[PDB]
Curated annotation (Swiss-Prot), chain A:
Fe cation binds at residues 111, 113, 304. It holds the Pfam family TauD. It comes from the Eukaryota. This is Clavaminate synthase-like protein At3g21360. Keywords: Acetylation, Iron, Metal-binding, Oxidoreductase. Binds 1 Fe cation per subunit. The keyword Ribosomal protein does not apply. Transmembrane segments: none annotated. Disulfide bonds: none annotated. Its EC number is 1.-.-.-. It comes from Arabidopsis thaliana. Its cofactor is Fe cation. GO terms for cellular component: cytosol; nucleus. The lineage of its organism: Eukaryota, Viridiplantae, Streptophyta, Embryophyta, Tracheophyta.
Length: 321, 322
């Protein structure tokens, strides 16, 4: 067959590079012909991903979870083994999983997948098996651009983060609440029912777990950096969950404003965090999904969100080491 | 090119009234001509042998298909799509195929009838082994009408009080969801709502009284409902309920199984008799070891199923019929 770099409305451009790059089709199209071209075009697709940081594959016959898994499987990358510290995921087939994100009428803030985890995914794929009835887009934005704008806007603020970093406080109940923006419990996060076994995996994950009265838990993480360095492209990125925590970690157990602070305890300037929230919006590209689309996101360069939505909707994913 | 569906015997099968349980079909050894067993030939033979497969499934309660090119979830969906049963109106792997949210391997799943307390339960069910368990993992099955007949013969009075009073099912669920619980789902993720009024309205649509505990939780009561139904296709009574199941497997921090199921009038069931029912179920069951490629078809009106503990890997898919 073949692969074709195609233009779309939403995409943006940076130094003559489309974001995201879009690949579409030009023996009639088949699912085994596609996975076959994926292997045949490995170099081309590694570079395109390197140049753009994400590529949406639209038009190909990926019509099921198993189908998406063949495409994920065809890509070669090794799966990232789960260790705990993320919403309750449900295995579907092979390297592909699902997870009932926060309530459908909410906004999922921008973040890097498992950003506060030691072994975070280098890459990830998103796949739509069920088109959203309304809304429910997976807006994406280039982390390095957000860095070039933050350093430009608030140069002193970045400097404090580069020296002080951030601290995160995330109170977790014993069970999971499907109502909160971040409703995972401690037994679910750490895949443990026992406390010792838990507080142990807690230290291994680099967290300060301290059991709460009502069987809950209050974890503390950091100081940790906010500006990491993607070596493959020699550039720093906004690899932190500042906006996610400050505006998103909001429920009966956590205060948004207290969710995250400077690495040395000093509170963050509200007008600065929300200014960052505004930078993410402006630079983000939210391509409306379609049944069959496959988006390849490099986790070193991209943060992902989720617009609110009205069901039905089914987006599947795959995490790479 | 044609294919022979050959009835075959296996060590684990039983026989009642001369009929095998479960009936087992496989493709012959030396056929004339010799067919190149394929998945597309199998599904065509299933469509062509509809009547024969209706009689076998009709008289045996379940039919295990052994020795067929069912090599992936895609192949399994093609089989289910050849039998012609309507799909049960609504995770999803492909088409009508899906993975069943289960408990840890070391645990044993109690015997039951699929969706036994849901107005529109599956009439028929399919199980498929894509990956045979390293150890155990079998999907034991048992004939519901046999359990009924033996219980009535051993405990006539108790059976008489079962049909007359029925059963009461109690569940004390939290607001949130405990991951480590066989019945961990709380009222939120149960009735898809945060609002207490709507939630209780929905539980009521499901024929159930919903109580609001002061601890932010909820207590639900179902019944009285029969513990014994009548298979019309086979003109016989079936032990269609979840008594033994709930009495032994409905436990966690908020729930005690001993009081999870009682007589429809609130009177507790005799522990000795429930365990005695557990005994009959275990004796009459058939636990055929799973071989990759197998697809088991169960008539949900005549058969209760459960699971054995196992050591992974193990992968089984399923499909439900209206
Ligand atoms: Fe995410
Ligand atoms: Fe079951």
């Amino acid at each position: 067959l073949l692969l074709v770099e195609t233009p779309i409305p939403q995409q943006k451009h940076y130094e003559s590079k489309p974001f995201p790059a879009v690949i579409s089709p030009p023996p009639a199209l088949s699912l085994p012909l596609f996975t076959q071209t994926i292997k045949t075009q490995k170099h081309y697709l590694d570079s395109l991903l390197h140049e753009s940081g994400a590529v949406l594959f639209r038009g190909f016959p990926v019509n099921s979870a198993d189908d998406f898994n063949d495409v994920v499987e065809a890509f070669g990358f090794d799966e990232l083994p789960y260790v705990g510290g993320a919403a309750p995921r449900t295995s579907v087939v092979g390297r592909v999983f699902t997870a009932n994100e926060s309530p459908p009428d909410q906004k999922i803030p921008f973040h890097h997948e498992m950003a506060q985890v030691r072994e975070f995914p280098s890459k990830l794929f998103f796949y739509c098996e069920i088109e959203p009835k309304c809304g429910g887009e997976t807006p994406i934005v280039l982390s390095h651009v957000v860095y070039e704008r933050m350093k430009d806007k608030h140069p002193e603020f970045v400097q404090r983060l580069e020296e002080h970093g951030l601290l995160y406080v995330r109170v977790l109940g014993e069970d999971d609440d499907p109502s909160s923006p971040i409703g995972r419990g401690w037994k679910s996060t750490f895949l443990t029912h026992d406390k010792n076994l838990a507080e142990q995996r807690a230290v291994d994950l680099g967290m300060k777990l301290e059991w709460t009265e009502d069987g809950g838990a209050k974890t503390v993480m950091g100081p940790i950096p906010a500006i990491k360095y993607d070596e493959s492209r020699n550039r720093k990125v906004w690899f932190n969950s500042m906006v996610a925590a400050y505006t998103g970690w909001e429920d009966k157990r956590n205060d948004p404003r207290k969710a995250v602070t400077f690495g040395d305890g000093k509170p963050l300037p509200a007008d600065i965090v929300h200014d960052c929230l505004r930078i993410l919006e402006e630079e983000c590209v939210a391509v409306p999904w379609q049944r069959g689309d496959v988006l390849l996101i490099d986790n070193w360069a991209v943060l992902h969100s989720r617009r609110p939505f009205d069901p039905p909707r089914r987006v599947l994913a795959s995490l790479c080491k």
